[PDB]
Design a protein around this ligand. Sequence first.
Ligand SMILES: *C(N)[C@H](C[C@@H]1CCN[C@@H]1O)NC(=O)[C@H](CC(C)C)NC(=O)c1ccc(-c2ccc(OCC)cc2)cc1
Ligand SMILES: *C(N)[C@H](C[C@@H]1CCN[C@@H]1O)NC(=O)[C@H](CC(C)C)NC(=O)c1ccc(-c2ccc(OCC)cc2)cc1
Lengths: 305, 305
Amino acid sequence: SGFRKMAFPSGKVEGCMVQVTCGTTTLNGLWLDDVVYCPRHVICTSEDMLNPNYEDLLIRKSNHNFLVQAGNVQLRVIGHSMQNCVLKLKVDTANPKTPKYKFVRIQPGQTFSVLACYNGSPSGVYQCAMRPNFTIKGSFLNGSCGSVGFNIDYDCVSFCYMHHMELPTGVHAGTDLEGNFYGPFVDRQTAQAAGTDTTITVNVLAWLYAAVINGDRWFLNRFTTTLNDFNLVAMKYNYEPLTQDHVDILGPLSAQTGIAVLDMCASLKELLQNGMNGRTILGSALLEDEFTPFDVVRQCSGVTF
Amino acid sequence: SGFRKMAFPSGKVEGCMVQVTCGTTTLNGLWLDDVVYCPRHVICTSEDMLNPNYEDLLIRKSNHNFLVQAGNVQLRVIGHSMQNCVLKLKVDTANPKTPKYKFVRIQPGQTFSVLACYNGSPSGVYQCAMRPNFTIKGSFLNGSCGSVGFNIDYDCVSFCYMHHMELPTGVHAGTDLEGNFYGPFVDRQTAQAAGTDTTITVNVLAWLYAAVINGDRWFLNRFTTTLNDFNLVAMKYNYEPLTQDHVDILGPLSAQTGIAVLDMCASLKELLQNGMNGRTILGSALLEDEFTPFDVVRQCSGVTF
Ligand SMILES: *C(N)[C@H](C[C@@H]1CCN[C@@H]1O)NC(=O)[C@H](CC(C)C)NC(=O)c1ccc(-c2ccc(OCC)cc2)cc1
Ligand SMILES: *C(N)[C@H](C[C@@H]1CCN[C@@H]1O)NC(=O)[C@H](CC(C)C)NC(=O)c1ccc(-c2ccc(OCC)cc2)cc1
C-alpha cells in the first residue's frame, strides 16, 4: 500500500527551537525545561574556528553575552556551562511547551528525524540513518547548527543528535545531547576523515521485506544461503556482516511474509552480484539501507504517536 | 551541502487532526475554526462502498450520529452538510489551535507535505508531488483517509489535499478541501483507471540544477539543443513538453549556476537516451521529478517558516 521515507511529526520539537546569539555568531538551540542546549562553537569567530581553545574562549564570555530568543520573546540567561561539545545555558523561564523527553545515544544503523532550522525557526523535516562510520547524509546550510535529530515513542521525544559540522566529502557530523561527537570528529575547521562507510545489511533486508509486502517480488529467487556464505559476499560489497541478532530482529517480518531470512539473503546476494539491470524496487534503482526493521513494521502497521 | 526530500514542519497541522466516527467507520478529520472536514465515505458500510448513493445514505444520518474526538475531548456536532466528496461537520467549539490557513487546489507537478494519520493521531510526514495524471504515490493504510496534504508559506498553511482512496496500481487519489477529486476518480469501490503518467520535466531540470549546486556535475555535456528538439525526445520518453513558462521558472537557477536551461536540456537528453550506466546523481540512480524549482531554491537558500 505504498512505502515512503517518513519522518516523525515534528510538532513537539518545533516548540523547543530557539535562537542563540553570541557576538556575531547565531545558531539554533534546544530549549527544554530551564536549559538551552547548543553547539559550543557559537562562541567562535570565523578565525577562532581554525584552531579553537574552547575553555579559553568561553572564559571571555559571561551570561549576558548570550542572547536567546524564542520567536520574539527574550529569555534571560542566568548561568552557562560547557559539557563536552555542547553549551548549556540556564535561563530564568522553563519552556512551557517542553514535551516528555529523553536524551539517547543511538547506535550506528539506527534512524531518526531531523528538524532543519535556521535562526531558531524550523525549515523542514527529513529522515536519515546514523551511518556505520557515524556520519549522516543530511541537508544543512550555514546557520543550521544546533538543529536536532529525534525519535518519537508515543508521547516521549528521544533526542539523539545535534548538528555541528560538514565534512570534506559533504556528509555531516554532530553530537548526542550530552555533547559527545558520534565518530572520531572534533569541532574544528580542519580536514577530517570519516572511515570507509558500509551498507547497513539488516536495513536492506527489512526494506526487501517491505517490498514483498507491497507487491514487489521479482527479486525473489529459488536459492538459499548460509550466514557465513552470505557474509563472504557482504564483505566483498562493503556490507555489514549479518549476525544472529540481526536474524532475530528480522523474525517478525519473516513470519508475516513467510520468507525465511536466509532465503532473502540469497535474493540480496544475487542482487549484489548481478545488479538491478534496469528494474526498480519500491521506486528506487538502488538498494536502500536507511529503513530499520522497526521502521518497516511501524509503517506497515500504522503506528501513531 | 546535501539535498534531501524534505517535508514542511507539521506542527501547525498536527493541532487540527481529529477523529471522526460514524457508525462503525472511523477516519481522520481536519478541525479548522468550528468546522470539521472529512471524506464523505465515513458514512458508508463496507457493503455501501461498492455502489454508494451518498445523498440517500446521508439522509439516514443526524448530527448525533457523528462522533468527533480531539485527543480525549469530545466535540459536539451541531450541523452537517455534504460539499462534493467532503463532509463538513459544524461543531460548537472553534479549534483554539487553528493556524492561519487557506484552501488551495494545486496544479499537477506541484508538491506538498502529507501528514499521515490514524484514529485522529499523526503518524508521520512525507513529501510528494501531484502526478500529471492526478495521483500521488503515498503510504496509506486502512484508517488513513482524511489525512491531508499542505504547503506552508511563512505562517500560513495552504491545505491542498485530503486522502480518499487507493487505486488498483497501488497509487492514491483524493480531493481538494472543497471535496473535488483531483483527476477522473470517484469515491466508490470499483476499478478505476489513472491515465498513463508522465515525468515532470521542469522538476527534473530543477533537480539537475540542485545536483550541480551540490557538486555533482559529471552529467554535464558539451552539447546544446532547442525547445522543439528536446520536446521530440521528451515525447518519446513520456516526459511533459517543456514550455517557455517552464524556462522562465528555471531562470533564477540558470543565473546562479551559470548554465543555460537549454544546455541542461541537452544533458538531460543524453541521460534519457544513454541511461545512467551505473552512476548516481544526488544519491539516486533514477531521474527524480518530485522537486519543484521552488523546492530547490528553498532548500538551497534555507527558507524558514
Ligand atoms: C553550523 N552552522 C555549520 C554547518 C555547516 C555549514 C555549511 N553546511 C555545514 O553543515 N557548522 C560549521 O560551520 C562548522 C564549524 C566548526 C567549528 C565545527 N565547520 C564545518 O562545517 C566545516 C569544517 C571543516 C571543513 C573542511 C576543512 C578542510 C578541508 O580540506 C580538505 C579538502 C575540507 C573541509 C568544512 C566545513
Ligand atoms: C481510507 N481510509 C481508505 C484508504 C485505502 C485503504 C488501504 N490504503 C488506501 O489508501 N480508503 C478506502 O478504503 C476507499 C473507500 C472508497 C469508498 C473511496 N476505497 C479504496 O481505497 C479502494 C477502492 C477500489 C479498489 C479496487 C477495486 C477494484 C479493482 O479491480 C482491478 C483488479 C482494484 C482495486 C481498491 C481500494
